Amino acid sequence: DLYSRYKKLQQELEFLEVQEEYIKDEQKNLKKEFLHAQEEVKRIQSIPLVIGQFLEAVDQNTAIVGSTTGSNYYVRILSTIDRELLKPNASVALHKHSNALVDVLPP
Amino acid sequence: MSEKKQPVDLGLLEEDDEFEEFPAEDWAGLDEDEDAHVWEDNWDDDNVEDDFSNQLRAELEKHGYKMETS
Amino acid sequence: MITSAAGIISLLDEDEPQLKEFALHKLNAVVNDFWAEISESVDKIEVLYEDEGFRSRQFAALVASKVFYHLGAFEESLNYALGAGDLFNVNDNSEYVETIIAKCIDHYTKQCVENADLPEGEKKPIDQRLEGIVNKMFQRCLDDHKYKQAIGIALETRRLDVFEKTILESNDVPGMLAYSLKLCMSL
Amino acid sequence: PPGGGEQEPPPPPAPQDVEMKEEAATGGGSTGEADGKTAAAAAEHSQRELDTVTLEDIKEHVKQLEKAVSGKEPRFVLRALRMLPSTSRRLNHYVLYKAVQGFFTSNNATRDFLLPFLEEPMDTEADLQFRPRTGKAASTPLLPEVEAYLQLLVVIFMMNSKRYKEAQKISDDLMQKISTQNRRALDLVAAKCYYYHARVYEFLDKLDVVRSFLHARLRTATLRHDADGQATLLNLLLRNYLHYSLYDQAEKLVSKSVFPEQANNNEWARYLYYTGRIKAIQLEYSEARRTMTNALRKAPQHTAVGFKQTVHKLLIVVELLLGEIPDRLQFRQPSLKRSLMPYFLLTQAVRTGNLAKFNQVLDQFGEKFQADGTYTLIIRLRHNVIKTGVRMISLSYSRISLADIAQKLQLDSPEDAEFIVAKAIRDGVIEASINHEKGYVQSKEMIDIYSTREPQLAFHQRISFCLDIHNMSVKAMRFPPKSYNKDL
Amino acid sequence: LEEGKAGSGLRQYYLSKIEELQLIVNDKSQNLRRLQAQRNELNAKVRLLREELQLLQEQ
């Protein structure tokens, strides 16, 4: 036990040692993956799009939008946009296909 | 430690027991002109003041006599 | 006795060693007081050690070996504690002797791992007084073995006949082989 | 008789609650904190114990307590004694012995029961299990209480407390090197002990005992230390070396080792003042200026006032050597003010530098700065006057006259003018052009800064050093958030 | 005797300091893996935004 605790413990030293370069590999790779998915959800946001109009926000991060055609649409808004753009009478602009908002326009 | 502050402060109480409120009041004779005036300026003003407290303190009254003589 | 004496430096810088020797004797009393006052005479101690002109290489190498671990690396102290030749030294609970046999044992089994993977060819020389002072304190543990570290160090020292003398006087022999293989499969 | 007789049992019953609540709070907080895993959680009570010590340094504790308040002295810890299991009846006893002194009165005294403080440390300090941490947590706070008021034959009582301290823990230890949070406590605790009866030491004795052992205890830590407490033990050695050592082949540059992580948020300041005080005798102009001014600017926590008059006074003492003496400018406290109240006339007498007058001025009202000892840096000042004044001449124009500026430097000869100006030339601190065309001595006196004069090479090193400081500060905002997210 | 108590005892004390070093490697592994769980959950969160992207394709 007592003197066996040394060389028994050395294997725990090595096993905790091996997590070092492993957590280096994860911390270097997953941030590269983070800018992968970050740039990939960025390039979803494309400038040709349709402009609607905002009517009401019925809960947080999900709202309704009056389209240009007058029909009201229910869209979960994108998370990066803060609560300033939840203005009820606003010039909101969704995508032409994704129909999620990139930016609102100044009147 | 900050317990070696204690004999240094015993030295300070000996310094305050040298003169008992003779320098606080007499130096407060200068402090009552000097209180709330920014003392970085009082080092410049004290610098040229103590520089000219010996001689030629005002001296701008003398330069008109330095015109014809120099 | 002394603290700031530099006359001992000038006497250590002096020939006719019958005045050097008791000066070194009185240096060995004040060494734990001041090793750093000896740090300037380290060079002269080394010079009177490297030659065989002065008669006592262990009075030199003990002083240098006890000032180096106060100054720098335990290797350079260790080369003169191990390079002091024959040293008549009893076991003591003093810090100096246990540190030098401590780093001696650690670097000894370091050498034993360094040559445990090399059974044949380019075999590095191990001085025999290292084996003597490792197995002297080791067999000193093996007066009674203390029922544990005989097989432990005997596996750490990576040496062949170190453990047959452990099992010669050993109590509960299947306890020692099961304890033994228990340690051996855990390493 | 009614005045103090009616208000006598009133005032007292007030530090009892905060001291008993404090010893139960840090005692039960320390044992109840690190009890299960002392080795995992470390130094959480480091700032707690030191902040309680600095919290009790300004105790107005004993003013009247010599008269019939001394029941607090024979009482003590008494927690869970005589048996490690079955402490429930002792949980009753905790209220019992505190309640016995609260029925009518108590037979009390002050100076009788000091020597049998070792009755419980013979058998069981607290529990027979946590004996180190409960032994030091029991004994070490109460020893500055009874050994407060060091005067009036308590020095001998301090010697009793010394031999009790060594006798139970720090003769060697009970287990050599505890290697836990109370080992790391016992470093600065044993240090604090040695500072506390260091007044007893320097009171009549000097360097010749526990200080000589403290090198062996200083190296018994094995070296594998972070060496914080080892540095605190070094500080008493260097303060012991302040008054009289003067030899430099050991402590100066020899004692200088690895320079460990020695922080404490105090020990940089006071350690650095100590090595700047001893490095102040060779008149260090570059290094001790900036770093001793830095050590002035450290320790803001408790006071920036009462102690930094010493690093401040020594600082300006070595600052007026260089010709440029900044006074007390940005810090307003009337302790340094009274500290420089003698020094002001002479430190303003630095710059004008009048020989015969100010030579009389120094020794004239010289009482405490010349009674401060051996007149050393003021005796270097007495002929540093003309060197700092001629350094102001270097801040003035180039050519040296034989009447105007030679008379102005009170120095009237052709030889000594160029000779002592040449003694400023062999410094290298100036820029000057030794020329004799007709006998007049020129100088180019170029104080042009490196602006459009090799700038890349100039603040090259500023960029490298500054970015290393800012980026190791970036390390210092990387790793303590690791020390945040470690627990969770 | 005085080795397993003293010399191997301080060797065991050095092993306890090695356990302090594995308390440093331990808590670095702790807080670096909590940072790793943070980046895993955040990049996982924008990946779940790509799961929402079919409901973006819903117009």
Side-chain angles (χ1 to χ4, degrees):
Chain A
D1 285 329
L2 196 276
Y3 197 73
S4 175
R5 184 172 64 192
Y6 183 76
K7 193 176 287 183
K8 177 69 175 178
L9 185 56
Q10 296 293 320
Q11 187 175 1
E12 183 176 357
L13 271 67
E14 294 174 351
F15 187 79
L16 193 61
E17 187 272 331
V18 76
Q19 306 302 319
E20 289 290 328
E21 191 272 332
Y22 172 61
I23 201 68
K24 300 293 182 294
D25 290 331
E26 281 181 345
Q27 76 180 356
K28 72 179 290 185
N29 289 316
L30 275 81
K31 60 173 67 174
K32 297 188 290 291
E33 298 176 355
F34 179 72
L35 54 90
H36 273 292
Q38 177 65 40
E39 287 176 350
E40 281 169 352
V41 301
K42 179 64 174 66
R43 62 186 289 267
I44 298 302
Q45 289 184 353
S46 296
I47 309 101
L49 55 84
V50 66
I51 292 96
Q53 63 185 358
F54 193 79
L55 194 149
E56 282 179 352
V58 292
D59 53 354
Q60 179 60 40
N61 290 316
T62 306
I64 64 171
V65 49
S67 67
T68 308
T69 63
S71 63
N72 293 318
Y73 291 164
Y74 179 75
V75 169
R76 179 170 180 80
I77 60 98
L78 195 144
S79 64
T80 308
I81 286 93
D82 55 355
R83 64 182 292 274
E84 193 275 333
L85 285 76
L86 293 174
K87 188 174 180 180
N89 45 2
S91 176
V92 74
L94 300 174
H95 280 287
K96 58 182 178 290
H97 287 86
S98 299
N99 287 113
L101 54 91
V102 178
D103 187 70
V104 299
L105 301 175
Chain B
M1 287 78 77
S2 297
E3 295 183 355
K4 298 180 183 181
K5 294 182 180 181
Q6 288 184 355
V8 179
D9 289 335
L10 291 174
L12 286 184
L13 291 176
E14 289 182 352
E15 292 180 0
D16 296 330
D17 284 327
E18 289 178 354
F19 287 157
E20 286 290 325
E21 296 291 323
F22 262 161
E25 291 177 353
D26 291 331
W27 287 101
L30 278 77
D31 292 331
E32 68 178 1
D33 289 330
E34 196 176 0
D35 195 2
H37 295 99
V38 176
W39 293 268
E40 191 270 331
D41 187 74
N42 291 313
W43 170 68
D44 286 328
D45 196 2
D46 201 356
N47 194 1
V48 176
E49 187 269 330
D50 198 3
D51 197 0
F52 291 165
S53 64
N54 192 3
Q55 286 295 110
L56 60 100
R57 183 181 62 80
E59 177 60 30
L60 270 69
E61 298 172 354
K62 190 180 177 181
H63 289 92
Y65 295 153
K66 290 171 68 177
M67 293 179 185
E68 67 273 14
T69 63
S70 297
Chain C
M1 185 64 73
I2 49 93
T3 55
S4 65
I8 57 172
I9 290 173
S10 296
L11 289 173
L12 191 145
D13 294 333
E14 188 65 29
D15 54 355
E16 55 179 359
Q18 69 271 16
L19 52 83
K20 180 186 288 293
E21 285 168 350
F22 64 90
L24 187 147
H25 177 271
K26 294 182 181 180
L27 193 149
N28 284 318
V30 298
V31 54
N32 54 1
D33 287 331
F34 288 94
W35 58 271
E37 189 266 331
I38 315 296
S39 65
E40 295 87 3
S41 296
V42 159
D43 53 357
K44 185 63 185 293
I45 294 164
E46 288 168 353
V47 168
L48 64 93
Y49 171 70
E50 288 290 327
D51 56 354
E52 61 181 358
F54 181 73
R55 62 186 180 183
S56 184
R57 66 192 187 276
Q58 67 270 16
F59 281 163
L62 258 60
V63 169
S65 73
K66 74 179 73 173
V67 73
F68 286 161
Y69 83 106
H70 285 176
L71 194 153
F74 296 98
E75 283 289 328
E76 193 179 2
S77 68
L78 189 61
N79 294 125
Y80 290 166
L82 297 176
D86 194 3
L87 177 59
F88 296 98
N89 193 0
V90 298
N91 190 7
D92 193 0
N93 288 319
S94 179
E95 185 269 334
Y96 165 71
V97 58
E98 67 188 0
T99 47
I100 61 97
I101 68 172
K103 277 80 178 177
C104 173
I105 284 164
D106 295 330
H107 297 92
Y108 171 71
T109 188
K110 171 68 179 295
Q111 296 294 321
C112 291
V113 175
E114 283 173 352
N115 291 320
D117 51 353
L118 275 74
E120 75 275 14
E122 62 268 10
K123 190 74 173 179
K124 288 186 181 180
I126 299 168
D127 195 0
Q128 301 299 318
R129 68 184 68 87
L130 275 72
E131 297 292 333
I133 67 171
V134 164
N135 290 318
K136 181 173 72 174
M137 285 68 168
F138 175 73
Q139 187 60 250
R140 180 187 56 75
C141 304
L142 269 67
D143 296 332
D144 205 3
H145 309 278
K146 62 193 23 284
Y147 69 86
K148 53 181 73 65
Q149 78 275 17
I151 197 64
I153 299 170
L155 266 296
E156 288 180 356
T157 188
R158 292 287 186 273
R159 210 265 307 281
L160 62 90
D161 61 347
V162 66
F163 56 86
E164 281 80 3
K165 57 186 178 67
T166 67
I167 54 96
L168 194 145
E169 46 170 0
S170 63
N171 294 320
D172 302 332
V173 179
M176 297 299 107
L177 272 72
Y179 178 78
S180 177
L181 191 142
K182 181 177 75 174
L183 180 61
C184 289
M185 70 180 291
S186 66
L187 70 94
Chain D
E6 285 174 352
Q7 296 181 0
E8 183 73 27
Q16 178 180 4
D17 297 330
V18 300
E19 287 292 329
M20 287 176 65
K21 179 66 176 177
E22 184 65 32
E23 67 184 2
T26 57
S30 296
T31 63
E33 187 268 330
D35 53 356
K37 295 295 289 183
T38 308
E44 295 87 6
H45 292 279
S46 65
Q47 74 279 13
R48 298 290 178 266
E49 285 179 352
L50 68 88
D51 283 330
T52 54
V53 166
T54 60
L55 189 145
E56 71 195 1
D57 200 3
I58 319 104
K59 284 290 283 183
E60 205 69 29
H61 184 74
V62 47
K63 63 180 74 64
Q64 196 178 2
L65 278 72
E66 295 293 326
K67 291 184 179 293
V69 196
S70 67
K72 268 64 180 296
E73 299 176 356
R75 76 174 182 86
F76 59 97
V77 178
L78 287 90
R79 305 288 287 176
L81 270 304
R82 187 76 277 284
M83 191 175 177
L84 176 60
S86 297
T87 58
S88 297
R89 295 178 179 89
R90 294 168 181 83
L91 294 169
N92 296 318
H93 282 91
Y94 296 155
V95 184
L96 286 173
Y97 76 92
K98 297 178 189 294
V100 170
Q101 295 182 356
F103 290 111
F104 287 162
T105 46
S106 295
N107 296 113
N108 296 321
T110 64
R111 297 177 185 270
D112 196 2
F113 181 70
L114 183 72
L115 301 172
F117 285 177
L118 301 181
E119 187 268 329
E120 297 298 328
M122 282 302 293
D123 192 3
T124 51
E125 282 82 5
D127 54 356
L128 186 61
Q129 183 178 2
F130 293 105
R131 291 174 67 188
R133 58 187 294 167
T134 59
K136 62 185 75 173
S139 296
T140 64
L142 52 81
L143 293 166
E145 285 189 353
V146 183
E147 301 301 327
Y149 286 162
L150 188 148
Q151 305 297 321
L152 282 79
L153 59 87
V154 190
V155 172
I156 300 167
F157 286 168
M158 187 57 216
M159 189 72 206
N160 296 114
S161 294
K162 289 175 190 178
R163 67 172 63 86
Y164 290 164
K165 286 161 184 66
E166 286 107 18
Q168 66 188 355
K169 63 181 185 296
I170 47 171
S171 269
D172 120 295
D173 207 354
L174 67 90
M175 61 186 77
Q176 46 35 296
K177 193 67 71 176
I178 317 291
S179 70
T180 53
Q181 190 179 4
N182 54 358
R183 183 263 195 102
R184 290 183 292 275
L186 180 61
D187 300 334
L188 53 91
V189 166
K192 182 182 69 66
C193 162
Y194 293 156
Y195 301 120
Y196 189 75
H197 55 75
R199 294 182 182 92
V200 165
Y201 283 164
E202 287 180 353
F203 187 75
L204 60 97
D205 286 330
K206 63 182 177 67
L207 163 56
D208 278 80
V209 84
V210 180
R211 307 171 179 183
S212 291
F213 176 71
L214 195 142
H215 305 285
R217 191 177 174 87
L218 188 70
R219 287 184 174 275
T220 194
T222 331
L223 275 66
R224 299 293 185 270
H225 239 279
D226 190 75
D228 194 4
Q230 182 171 0
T232 64
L233 293 174
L234 186 146
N235 291 123
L236 68 90
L237 295 177
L238 206 151
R239 187 187 65 81
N240 191 10
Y241 295 164
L242 190 146
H243 69 277
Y244 184 78
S245 285
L246 283 71
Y247 56 90
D248 296 337
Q249 70 271 16
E251 73 275 20
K252 306 296 287 185
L253 295 173
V254 223
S255 27
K256 26 249 90 288
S257 294
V258 192
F259 286 166
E261 294 179 355
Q262 296 175 349
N264 201 8
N265 294 123
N266 192 0
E267 195 175 6
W268 286 111
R270 55 182 61 196
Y271 165 76
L272 208 154
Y273 169 68
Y274 289 163
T275 186
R277 177 70 177 90
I278 308 299
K279 282 190 288 185
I281 198 164
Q282 74 273 19
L283 282 71
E284 180 66 30
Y285 290 160
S286 180
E287 188 268 334
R289 179 74 172 87
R290 56 168 181 80
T291 193
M292 186 168 68
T293 313
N294 195 3
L296 183 151
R297 289 188 180 95
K298 299 301 185 287
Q301 295 86 16
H302 192 275
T303 56
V305 174
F307 184 74
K308 308 300 178 293
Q309 62 186 3
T310 315
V311 63
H312 184 74
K313 182 176 173 65
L314 184 73
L315 179 61
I316 52 95
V317 159
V318 306
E319 280 177 354
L320 50 82
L321 303 175
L322 287 85
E324 298 294 326
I325 175 65
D327 288 331
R328 186 187 62 82
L329 268 65
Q330 64 184 356
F331 286 166
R332 179 186 60 80
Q333 56 267 10
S335 298
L336 279 70
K337 291 178 72 67
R338 291 179 179 91
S339 300
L340 194 142
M341 277 180 182
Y343 207 83
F344 183 73
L345 184 62
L346 68 95
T347 193
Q348 189 62 256
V350 170
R351 291 171 176 171
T352 59
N354 197 0
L355 296 171
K357 300 291 187 180
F358 294 151
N359 194 1
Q360 186 59 256
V361 170
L362 295 170
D363 196 1
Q364 182 65 40
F365 64 95
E367 194 270 331
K368 186 175 174 65
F369 62 95
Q370 79 181 2
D372 201 2
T374 63
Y375 55 85
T376 59
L377 195 53
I378 190 166
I379 213 72
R380 297 187 186 95
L381 178 59
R382 282 182 61 248
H383 288 179
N384 201 1
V385 168
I386 198 65
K387 186 165 72 66
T388 58
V390 82
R391 189 171 297 167
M392 187 62 207
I393 299 301
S394 71
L395 297 172
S396 177
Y397 298 95
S398 174
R399 309 291 182 90
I400 179 162
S401 178
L402 195 147
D404 288 331
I405 202 160
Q407 181 184 0
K408 189 177 75 66
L409 292 173
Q410 294 88 21
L411 183 141
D412 47 358
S413 176
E415 291 86 3
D416 58 358
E418 192 271 332
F419 186 74
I420 299 171
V421 162
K423 300 299 178 291
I425 289 167
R426 64 181 289 276
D427 298 331
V429 298
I430 48 93
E431 172 166 350
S433 172
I434 304 98
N435 294 313
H436 294 88
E437 181 70 26
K438 64 189 76 63
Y440 290 167
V441 179
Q442 283 74 12
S443 70
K444 56 188 176 294
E445 67 170 2
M446 182 179 284
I447 318 171
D448 180 73
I449 58 176
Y450 66 91
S451 297
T452 66
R453 187 63 177 169
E454 295 292 329
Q456 303 88 16
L457 191 147
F459 61 92
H460 181 275
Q461 57 180 355
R462 176 66 181 173
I463 286 165
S464 67
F465 285 162
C466 84
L467 281 174
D468 285 329
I469 296 299
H470 301 107
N471 201 359
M472 74 179 286
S473 301
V474 170
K475 302 296 182 183
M477 66 173 283
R478 284 169 187 173
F479 190 78
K482 272 78 175 176
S483 296
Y484 159 61
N485 207 356
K486 58 177 283 183
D487 57 354
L488 54 92
Chain E
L1 195 63
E2 294 293 327
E3 192 273 332
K5 302 291 180 68
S8 179
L10 65 89
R11 186 180 180 91
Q12 179 63 42
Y13 288 164
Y14 176 66
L15 183 65
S16 68
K17 293 184 282 188
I18 287 300
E19 292 181 353
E20 299 173 353
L21 265 70
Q22 300 294 318
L23 185 60
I24 296 168
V25 176
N26 192 3
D27 65 358
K28 284 187 289 183
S29 64
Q30 286 172 349
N31 52 34
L32 267 74
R33 83 170 61 87
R34 294 293 296 164
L35 181 61
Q36 189 54 249
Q38 182 179 1
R39 297 294 178 271
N40 191 5
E41 199 274 334
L42 183 60
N43 197 0
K45 181 178 184 292
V46 298
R47 182 62 65 193
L48 297 177
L49 183 61
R50 191 190 180 275
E51 185 186 3
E52 296 293 327
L53 178 60
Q54 63 182 356
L55 297 174
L56 275 68
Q57 194 180 4
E58 197 195 4
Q59 311 295 116

